[PDB]
Amino acid sequence: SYAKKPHISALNAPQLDQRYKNEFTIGAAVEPYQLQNEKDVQMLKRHFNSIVAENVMKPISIQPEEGKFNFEQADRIVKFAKANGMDIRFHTLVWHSQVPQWFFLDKEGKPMVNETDPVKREQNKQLLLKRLETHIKTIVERYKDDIKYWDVVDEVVGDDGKLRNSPWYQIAGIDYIKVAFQAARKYGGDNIKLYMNDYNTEVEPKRTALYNLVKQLKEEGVPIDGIGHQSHIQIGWPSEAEIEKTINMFAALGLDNQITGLDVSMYGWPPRAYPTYDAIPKQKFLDQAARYDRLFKLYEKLSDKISNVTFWGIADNHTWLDSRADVYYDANGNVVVDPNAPYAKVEKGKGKDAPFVFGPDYKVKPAYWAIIDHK
Ligand SMILES: [Cl-]
Ligand SMILES: [Cl-]
Ligand SMILES: [Zn+2]
Ligand SMILES: [Zn+2]
Ligand SMILES: [Zn+2]
Ligand SMILES: [Zn+2]
Ligand SMILES: [Zn+2]
Ligand SMILES: [Zn+2]
Ligand SMILES: [Zn+2]
């Protein structure tokens, strides 16, 4: 939406959170160093009223060795949010990636997944669940008064629609999910809100598997308050109709919905990225702006079912999507971005994506104008 609207500094632009303040909070994912950068601080103060840590609250960042808790980085994000009246989301108590390996070693130091004795396997289950409870207990006892929203587990359902067969599941079975939510509620009390977070929540068979899993857990009294939809999406996928169907499906269970990691990639999958920001054609930003226009129109339509929309970053100069921005080169060394076209080599993660409404120079994109207006 719209091109005659100018490329002005985002620090001079109408505030994004204020535009949406009766519909949902507007969040950004951050690293501690961005809180030491004048531009990023001014962006967070101007446009956002919710915050989450990109990385410093993940299990391996918090407890890299058993008994060694590293809260200093997480504390800095909590401090900044309190000083600026921001909601905080905790990402994340449990995840199969970025996972300290000590969790899954038995008393003899051997991988628990390798045990064959059923009596010893049950001992490893109880030991892993005890470690899980202590991890969650320590974090929630520190932050329960400060952090309202918790990703209790991330990505526990596989893309094949079965439970993800991570070491958590191999060793402890489904109970690791139940234990995590129960521990968060026990040590955090009734006022913190507990979420199951995942990507491709719109895609079958994952969508209905997520639905059935959460429905069953709530029937058994496991405290789950909502679903986090990571929403790592593309310009043309998934459809707005399928997003709407997903959000309604989970709201029908009585669950809150949060959009927890929104980015709108310029590319498909696997991505064939441009090598630099400057090489991305202007038309891509117009296509992106129209996608954002439709997306936030839908979020507003469903505002009674969505409490928060968080972007997985601040401005286009920093996005984890760049780690996926593979650049394909033909035999003559020219960039290939056509997903079917011939090519000779790929430089993995060397390109540039552009997923936000704010450009890498902190000036507003067409996508910003598309979601700040009321059309
Ligand atoms: Cl990143
Ligand atoms: Cl620019
Ligand atoms: Zn308004
Ligand atoms: Zn504000
Ligand atoms: Zn450049
Ligand atoms: Zn709402
Ligand atoms: Zn980052
Ligand atoms: Zn610019
Ligand atoms: Zn609009």
UniProtKB/Swiss-Prot annotation:
Its EC number is 3.2.1.8. The active site is at 155 (proton donor), 261 (nucleophile). GO terms for molecular function: endo-1,4-beta-xylanase activity. It catalyses: Endohydrolysis of (1->4)-beta-D-xylosidic linkages in xylans. InterPro entries: GH10 (IPR044846), GH10_AS (IPR031158), GH10_dom (IPR001000), Glycoside_hydrolase_SF (IPR017853). Gene3D superfamilies: Glycosidases (3.20.20.80). This is Endo-1,4-beta-xylanase.
